[PDB]
Design a protein around this nucleic acid. Structure first.
Lengths: 111, 52, 93, 64, 104
RNA sequence: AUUGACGGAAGGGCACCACCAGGAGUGGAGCCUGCGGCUUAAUUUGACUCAACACGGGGAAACUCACCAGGUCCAGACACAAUAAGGAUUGACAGAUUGAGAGCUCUUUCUUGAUUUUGUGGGUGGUGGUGCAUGGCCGUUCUUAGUUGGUGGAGUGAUUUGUCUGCUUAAUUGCGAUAACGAACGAGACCUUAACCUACUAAAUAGUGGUGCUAGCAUUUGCUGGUUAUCCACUUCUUAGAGGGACUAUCGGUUUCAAGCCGAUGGAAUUUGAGGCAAUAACAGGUCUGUGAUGCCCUUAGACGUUCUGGGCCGCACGCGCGCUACACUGACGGAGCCAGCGAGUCUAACCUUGGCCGAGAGGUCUUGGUAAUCUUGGAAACUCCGUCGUGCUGGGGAUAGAGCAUUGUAAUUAUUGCUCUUCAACGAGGAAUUCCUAGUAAGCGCAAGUCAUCAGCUUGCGUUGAUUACGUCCCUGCC
């Protein structure tokens, strides 16, 4: 129970740990952001990302890794948290990615 | 054990940033409890586009 | 660091198990969420396990994220004497 | 001014501060701190007027 | 057949999903023909956090005013335990909160 | 020879941080604080042309806290060797000792129980230094107009115009002139709020009539009420969601009849007003005194680490800024009218407090409501009222003082504030200076928040009364 102000804030700030935690670990996967949803059942996070064939986990453990963090950090019953990653359709014009494709190009030993 | 932690509830040292963990600059304004250089930073995302 | 043979055993336990632990930088706490093992404990015994690679830390937001290591979870298989059936949250479609 | 050097973790290297009898019975001497912790063993040590107990850090006050 | 006078209370950050939901609302309910009102439309709260721009006194005195403008929005709706539930389940969505502060 | 730059050389723009046209002032004083400095137990510390001067949200009686004048206890991890259950060591009465009911010490000799103590190895306490070892942010050039690149095309090339003579704007904002064609960022678009919707959508946490119940004056049916339900019906109002709506519009001029600019009509309505985001390159501006962001030096128990006390940053012949009341009858005193808007607020406990009493008063309290469009909370001051004061430094001025009485606070002393009554200090419109300002704008009368236990002569935000003066220049400065 919180004052609507009080809610739509922490609800934005939610985009300030998935936006991050993915920043750093998924610095590889193609990090493609995310839709944080509510639906009357779940809280579902669709990871767009440009390499679903190391994120998916050699069967479904690497996806039961990033949830069973997203659950223990943010409290959720077990179920109220399914990660669908989803490719990234229109790759030429992400901005962020073609930057992550310099950082990855430079490191790798280039001029 | 009095003899390793002090009477830190109210003031500045008690509460500390979310993101960096600093005392310097604070945004209390709305369950926010960040710093008052970072904020802005992300934020534009977080909710706080602008409208000016 | 000098710990305890009923907290050293207890960690390396919801570490294998869920497999995956997410224990803040607040030294100075009775107690960590899901493990009675004060906080401060973990953090430091895990700075140890990481250090070898029976595990793998990731940082930021201020929590230390950890999460298993594909194998290094075959060390915990001989430490807390247990099967060589299961893989731990690991195979769960 | 001055450093200590930490107290020595010192060497009674054996023990037997528990009537070793001759032949075939062992019993238990200097009481055994009259508490449950303090269980059956606890060989009480002798200090100023009141006696001294370590299963509880040390503590306990029962004369001798 | 037990009747209940529900009250529908919405809020978002986009005037475009939101208006969408009392068009869908009050015409996925006049299909049902329900005894209701029309999307009441509540004073626009609207937070302006002054902050300086610089990272360091230095540097002119160089300031900001970012804010969330919600559009608060509510509704009405009668109907038993059956045809407020088939309505609350349906509008289903991105951006938005629905309460059902029930009036039994 | 080249432009990133430089000139106290010429030629153009742009802004009341630059002048006109002017208003209210600062600089004068009675006093607020803050920075110079002498003082000192110590008078901690950053900050010094626009970019240091009620500024680190610095409103500090402890504390905070960095200055001392002094008391302690370590809150010395980890390994090694040494003391070695024959006690490593711990603790304490009270008295000697001191602020003291610190066993700080020493007197005693109880207690104490391998957790300590000692060196060796090493760490981690650090508002101690270094902002020029740096991070991150924020000031400045900036209420800026400005960058840069392709393909052409030009011109060993450092490369160039493209980014321009002119007219145009709040504006590299746009027509137009053009071996230059067409794009990116800035600006603008966009987001906030203030206006408008007698159309929608709903409201015993907003108000209408009708309805009684009803309390007065009239009696003329009328007029004045009281009623969180007597009922309902409403939704202008008041809230607030969707939504819409303005584009300089319509003629008329005015011009290269281009971009633009006046004026009058309709209109709610100088970029609709206003903020906020704010490229390009930076500055050795500031900051390790916001940090458990942090290099490298130093500190490591006679510590610069921590903590109980007391004073200290509030000390004055004085120098410099930011500010409050006043030199009046266009005011000071008083009855009697008597009016908003931004807030806030108690939960695990004392935030707002009425009401009804007690107090001249300051207040005390019983008790009340209120996690708030639901309570205190619809009653704030400039003012209209009706006058006393009569040109008397007053009946403008309210300085500095003597006591009491209160209201907080372990501490009220270098009286935190308040009241109760008297002491009745300058100054009789503020020199060389020098600011800020084009519309609900300049300025004054308030108050709610930010401190907070309190103590505002500051910071922020609002409205209630509300005009002069232009609505233009490059004389200046300043920068392009």
């Amino acid at each position: 129970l919180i004052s609507k102000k009080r809610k739509l804030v922490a609800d934005g700030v939610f985009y300030a740990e998935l936006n991050e935690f993915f920043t750093r670990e998924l610095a590889e996967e193609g990090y493609s952001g995310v839709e944080v949803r509510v639906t009357p059942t779940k809280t579902e996070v669709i990871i767009r990302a440009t390499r679903t064939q190391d994120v998916l986990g050699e069967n479904g453990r690497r996806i039961n890794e990033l949830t069973l963090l997203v659950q223990k950090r943010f409290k959720y019953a077990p179920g109220t948290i399914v990660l669908y990653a989803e490719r990234v359709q229109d790759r030429g014009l992400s901005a962020v990615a073609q930057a992550e494709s310099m950082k990855f190009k430079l490191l790798n030993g280039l001029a | 054990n009095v003899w390793f932690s002090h009477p830190r509830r109210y003031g500045k040292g008690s509460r500390q940033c979310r993101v960096c963990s600093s005392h310097t600059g604070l945004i209390r304004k709305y369950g926010l409890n960040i710093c008052r250089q970072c904020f802005r930073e992300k934020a534009n995302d977080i909710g706080f586009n602008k409208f000016r | 660091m000098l710990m305890p043979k009923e907290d050293r055993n207890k960690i390396h336990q919801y570490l294998f198990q869920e497999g995956v632990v997410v224990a803040k930088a607040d030294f100075n706490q009775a107690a960590h969420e899901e493990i009675d093992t004060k906080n401060l404990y973990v953090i430091k015994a895990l700075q140890s396990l990481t250090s070898k690679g029976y595990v793998k830390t990731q940082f930021s937001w201020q929590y230390y994220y950890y999460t298993l290591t594909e194998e290094g979870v075959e060390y915990l298989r001989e430490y807390l004497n247990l099967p060589e059936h299961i893989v731990p949250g690991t195979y769960i479609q | 001014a001055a450093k200590k050097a930490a107290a020595a973790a010192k060497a009674a290297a054996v023990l037997s501060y528990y009537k070793v009898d001759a032949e075939g019975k062992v019993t238990k001497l200097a009481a055994a701190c009259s508490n449950p912790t303090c269980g059956a063993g606890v060989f009480l040590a002798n200090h100023k007027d009141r006696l001294y107990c370590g299963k509880c850090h040390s503590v306990y006050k029962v004369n001798a | 057949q037990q009747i209940i006078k529900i009250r529908i209370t919405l809020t978002s950050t986009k005037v475009k999903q939101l208006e969408n939901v009392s068009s869908n609302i009050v015409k996925n309910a006049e299909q049902h023909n329900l005894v209701k009102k029309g999307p009441v439309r509540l004073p626009t709260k609207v937070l302006k956090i002054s902050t300086r721009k610089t990272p360091n006194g230095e540097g002119s005195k160089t300031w900001e005013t970012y804010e969330m403008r919600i559009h608060k929005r509510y509704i009405d709706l009668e109907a038993p335990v059956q045809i407020v539930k088939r309505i609350t389940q349906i509008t289903i969505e991105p951006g938005v909160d629905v309460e059902v502060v029930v009036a039994s």
